[PDB]
Amino acid sequence: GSCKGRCFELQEVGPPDCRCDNLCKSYSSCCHDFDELCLKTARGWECTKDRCGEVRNEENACHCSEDCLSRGDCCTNYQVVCKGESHWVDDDCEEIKVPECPAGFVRPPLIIFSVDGFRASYMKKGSKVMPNIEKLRSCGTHAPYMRPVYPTKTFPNLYTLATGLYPESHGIVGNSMYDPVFDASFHLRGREKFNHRWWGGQPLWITATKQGVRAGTFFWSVSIPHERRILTILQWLSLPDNERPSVYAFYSEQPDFSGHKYGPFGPEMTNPLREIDKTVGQLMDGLKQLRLHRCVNVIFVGDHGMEDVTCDRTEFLSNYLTNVDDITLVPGTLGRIRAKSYDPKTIIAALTCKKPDQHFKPYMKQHLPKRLHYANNRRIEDIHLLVDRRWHVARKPLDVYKKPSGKCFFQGDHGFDNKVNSMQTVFVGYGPTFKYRTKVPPFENIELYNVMCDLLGLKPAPNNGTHGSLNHLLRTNTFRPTMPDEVSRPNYPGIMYLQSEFDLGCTCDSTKERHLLYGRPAVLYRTSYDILYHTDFESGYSEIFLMPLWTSYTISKQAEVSSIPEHLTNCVRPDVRVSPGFSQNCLAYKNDKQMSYGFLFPPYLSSSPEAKYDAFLVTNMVPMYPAFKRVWAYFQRVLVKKYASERNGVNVISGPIFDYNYDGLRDTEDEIKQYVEGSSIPVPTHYYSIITSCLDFTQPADKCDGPLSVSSFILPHRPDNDESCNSSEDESKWVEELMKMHTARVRDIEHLTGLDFYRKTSRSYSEILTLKTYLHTYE
Numbered sequence: 150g151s152c153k154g155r156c157f158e159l160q161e162v163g164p165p166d167c168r169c170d171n172l173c174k175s176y177s178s179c180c181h182d183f184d185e186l187c188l189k190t191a192r193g194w195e196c197t198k199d200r201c202g203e204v205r206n207e208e209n210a211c212h213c214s215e216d217c218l219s220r221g222d223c224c225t226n227y228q229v230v231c232k233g234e235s236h237w238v239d240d241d242c243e244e245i246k247v248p249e250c251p252a253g254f255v256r257p258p259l260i261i262f263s264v265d266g267f268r269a270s271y272m273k274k275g276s277k278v279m280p281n282i283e284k285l286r287s288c289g290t291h292a293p294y295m296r297p298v299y300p301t302k303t304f305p306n307l308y309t310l311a312t313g314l315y316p317e318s319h320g321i322v323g324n325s326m327y328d329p330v331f332d333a334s335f336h337l338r339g340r341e342k343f344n345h346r347w348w349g350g351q352p353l354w355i356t357a358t359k360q361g362v363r364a365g366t367f368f369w370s371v372s373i374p375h376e377r378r379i380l381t382i383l384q385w386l387s388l389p390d391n392e393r394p395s396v397y398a399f400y401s402e403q404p405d406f407s408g409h410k411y412g413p414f415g416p417e418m419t420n421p422l423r424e425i426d427k428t429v430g431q432l433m434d435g436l437k438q439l440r441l442h443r444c445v446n447v448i449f450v451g452d453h454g455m456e457d458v459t460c461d462r463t464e465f466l467s468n469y470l471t472n473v474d475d476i477t478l479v480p481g482t483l484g485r486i487r488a489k490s491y492d493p494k495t496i497i498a499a500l501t502c503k504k505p506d507q508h509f510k511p512y513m514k515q516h517l518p519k520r521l522h523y524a525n526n527r528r529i530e531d532i533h534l535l536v537d538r539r540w541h542v543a544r545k546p547l548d549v550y551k552k553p554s555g556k557c558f559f560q561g562d563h564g565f566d567n568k569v570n571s572m573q574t575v576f577v578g579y580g581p582t583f584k585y586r587t588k589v590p591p592f593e594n595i596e597l598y599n600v601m602c603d604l605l606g607l608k609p610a611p612n613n614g615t616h617g618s619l620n621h622l623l624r625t626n627t628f629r630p631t632m633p634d635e636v637s638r639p640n641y642p643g644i645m646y647l648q649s650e651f652d653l654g655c656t657c658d659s660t661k662e663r664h665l666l667y668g669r670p671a672v673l674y675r676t677s678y679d680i681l682y683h684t685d686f687e688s689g690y691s692e693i694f695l696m697p698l699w700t701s702y703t704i705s706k707q708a709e710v711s712s713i714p715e716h717l718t719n720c721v722r723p724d725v726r727v728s729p730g731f732s733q734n735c736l737a738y739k740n741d742k743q744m745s746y747g748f749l750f751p752p753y754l755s756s757s758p759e760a761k762y763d764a765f766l767v768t769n770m771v772p773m774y775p776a777f778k779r780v781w782a783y784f785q786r787v788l789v790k791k792y793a794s795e796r797n798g799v800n801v802i803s804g805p806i807f808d809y810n811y812d813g814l815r816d817t818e819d820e821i822k823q824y825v826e827g828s829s830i831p832v833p834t835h836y837y838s839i840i841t842s843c844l845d846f847t848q849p850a851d852k853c854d855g856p857l858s859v860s861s862f863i864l865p866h867r868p869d870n871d872e873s874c875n876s877s878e879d880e881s882k883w884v885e886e887l888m889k890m891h892t893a894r895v896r897d898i899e900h901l902t903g904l905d906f907y908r909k910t911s912r913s914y915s916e917i918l919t920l921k922t923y924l925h926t927y928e
């Protein structure tokens with residue numbers, strides 16, 4: 150068989166027929182004439198003045214004979230060089246107010262141009278280096294940066310872009326992985342990447358296909374040059390409407406490859422950036438030549454950035470563990486440890502706060518910051534090392550390969566925590582469905598799959614994006630988000646019980662408007678809970694979990710911090726609105742030698758000696774380890790008031806999270822694995838707070854007319870502070886840094902609590918969704 154008239158065919162052939170498709174050279178074979186017919190290289194990829202009107206030679210990679218338009222095989226710059234047309238980049242931008250597409254185009258095509266290792270800061274280079282990219286950016290919709298997923302590696306991020314899912318959900322949790330159910334390893338080298346068993350979720354090309362939208366093959370054999378890929382995309386675009394794809398992908402391994410070699414700031418980086426820009430120019434000139442340049446939506450997107458990393462900055466596990474022969478380490482900009490064929494508790498202890506400058510931190514995966522969403526997959530090893538930016542971790546010195554000079558082969562790497570600035574990457578949308586010359590706030594790459602679906606008129610598969618949160622990127626929104634329905638209505642108990650009906654072993658001697666600024670959270674699961682009002686705070690008290698799901702209070706800029714009278718030490722009061730049978734009891738805490746308790750509304754911030762008594766109600770009490778109380782006390786005593794001063798008032802919503810199975814979702818009763826001893830009082834795995842104020846800080850938090858400003862955290866409820874290497878010191882030296890490490894989105898808290906916040910504002914729901922997906926990152 151021949152490839153004549155079949156080069157890079159889209160439709161599937163059977164095993165027996167010889168292949169002519171994008172991947173036929175990858176661990177496979179093509180028709181014998183595939184190279185001759187489909188991989189022409191003669192005379193390169195650019196028309197020159199001397200080639201214009203050349204006699205046609207069928208060996209040429211592309212053609213500059215005048216028949217090339219009718220044959221569909223011009224070089225992308227043919228009309229520029231030979232017919233006096235301008236390069237696309239030399240045309241001033243004009244708003245694409247409507248798609249300018251041929252008849253038979255049911256929708257604008259989507260072309261996804263992904264670049265590997267493209268730091269957000271490279272856009273600083275400007276038209277000097279990247280004129281085509283600069284035009285897309287300045288004339289289209291762009292963000293200052295896009296946040297990748299952790300780990301900030303290629304395959305996890307590419308497949309996240311494709312599926313809208315966290316790595317833990319789509320299954321590509323690294324560039325290297327071991328799956329203990331397969332008992333098999335995944336690597337980038339070799340053929341495992343082609344085995345479908347690794348890839349979960351539903352990538353865009355499958356979503357497209359299943360809904361009758363035709364996809365261009367997203368994948369190319371490594372031997373097929375970039376320029377051939379661009380020409381193929383353009384040729385596919387000229388197919389008749391019954392064969393033409395609506396979505397296309399081009400991927401470049403640059404600037405990542407050069408980034409590793411020369412580091413992100415090396416003078417050698419200019420050249421690769423120029424070459425990427427040339428490739429964009431080829432695509433745009435090609436589209437213009439097809440008159441599709443005001444028809445197609447283009448996304449220019451990176452998977453991650455690039456950090457300065459040299460092998461002199463390597464931590465070795467063998468400086469911490471005497472026996473390293475019994476462990477397998479996935480090394481580099483992150484660490485994952487498992488047994489080679491060993492005790493995890495011993496390993497963690499041996500790796501914890503051992504050296505003053507220690508450039509990694511060990512974790513059990515369930516204790517990693519929840520914002521990373523990196524635990525709920527069997528391919529993620531229990532033991533994880535978060536590596537400091539600019540560093541590597543390795544097993545022993547001999548695993549590092551140095552030149553004779555001592556210098557290493559690499560000066561850049563990536564993979565670090567996705568909060569790190571050097572890991573941030575790029576997003577640009579250009580075309581009729583994107584806004585014109587519009588800057589949008591930074592966002593997470595998990596959100597893009599929904600956008601790409603909307604651009605193609607596809608119903609997205611279930612994913613971790615928040616559908617509607619990027620509506621502000623698009624001219625026209627086919628999807629309009631709706632606020633979810635409240636599932637459980639609250640009770641509003643009055644005074645129902647006598648003091649004397651309580652045997653809890655405890656001893657002691659406008660609310661809405663000012664404390665719930667954005668409406669009551671909605672409970673989106675089936676349960677029984679009560680709204681409890683007080684002078685200084687409001688709560689939604691769970692009769693199932695015997696504590697608030699949420700506690701809401703406002704602290705003005707002028708609010709005063711007080712201390713507890715000695716007599717109120719150990720004070721807990723029964724709540725006459727809540728049944729003894731649905732209350733905590735103090736005996737459980739007395740008998741649980743490991744467990745103490747804290748309060749969601751702090752007595753410290755009571756508005757009067759009288760009101761302070763409300764804070765000591767059993768319904769405001771939550772189980773807290775002594776170690777964690779050090780964190781919580783400092784947050785409540787010092788930080789809340791600091792934030793109120795700095796932000797001109799703050800509204801605080803705090804509560805427990807239960808995630809014993811570390812899936813990032815609210816546990817049901819049955820999934821709770823720890824209770825206060827001898828009681829039905831469940832122990833939170835985490836405690837959250839959402840801190841809201843006016844974006845315009847000249848306005849107080851309770852009188853805000855415009856956009857809101859939020860910061861949130863999900864603190865691990867740990868019986869120790871081993872995570873914080875300075876925790877032997879005053880809380881002023883370490884608690885706030887701990888909190889910043891555990892920063893979160895409101896959305897993260899919503900998943901973990903089954904609550905919906907901000908249901909009553911003066912803001913559009915679309916805008917609220919962006920607020921909920923916002924992540925305040927620090928350091």
Ligand SMILES: *[C@@H]1O[C@H](CO)[C@@H](O[C@@H]2O[C@H](CO)[C@@H](O[C@@H]3O[C@H](CO[C@H]4O[C@H](CO[C@H]5O[C@H](CO)[C@@H](O)[C@H](O)[C@@H]5O)[C@@H](O)[C@H](O)[C@@H]4O)[C@@H](O)[C@H](O)[C@@H]3O)[C@H](O)[C@H]2NC(C)=O)[C@H](O)[C@H]1NC(C)=O
Pocket residue numbers: 314315317318319320349350522525526611612613812813814900
């Ligand atoms: C991020 O977004 C994902 C996708 O929406 C969320 O994951 C889903 O979580 C729900 C609720 O827990 C799951 O729903 C259940 O689905 C049952 C149907 O079976 C389907 O399960 C397979 C599992 O998916 C893969 O992903 C996990 C990830 O760890 C792998 O371990 C698995 O091996 C799979 O490869 C599906 O692929 C398949 O279609 C099955 O039909 C149903 O019977 C239950 O009643 C329940 O509804 C759902 O399975 C999850 N889907 C995916 C793709 O993971 C995830 O919670 C979100 N995370 C956060 C933090 O919000």
Ligand SMILES: CN(c1nc(-c2ccc(F)cc2)cs1)c1c(CCCNC(=O)c2ccc3[nH]c(=O)oc3c2)nc2ccc(C3CCN(S(C)(=O)=O)CC3)nn12
Pocket residue numbers: 261263265302303304307308310311324337342343344345348352353367368398400402405406
């Ligand atoms: C994952 N992947 C690709 N993804 C896209 C993509 C994703 C989203 C989107 F919106 C548009 C396109 C295109 S190709 C992919 C790749 C590319 C990897 C090449 N680069 C490297 O090897 C690389 C680069 C930099 C690195 N830095 C570093 O440390 O390591 C690096 C490596 N190659 C492949 C091969 C196979 C596949 C699978 C094929 C099967 N399908 S499925 C089951 O859906 O049919 C899944 C994907 N993807 N792939």
Ligand SMILES: [Ca+2]
Pocket residue numbers: 807808809810811812813814815816820
């Ligand atoms: Ca859970």
Ligand SMILES: [Zn+2]
Pocket residue numbers: 265266302303304405452453
């Ligand atoms: Zn990459």
Ligand SMILES: [Zn+2]
Pocket residue numbers: 266303405406409563
């Ligand atoms: Zn790389």
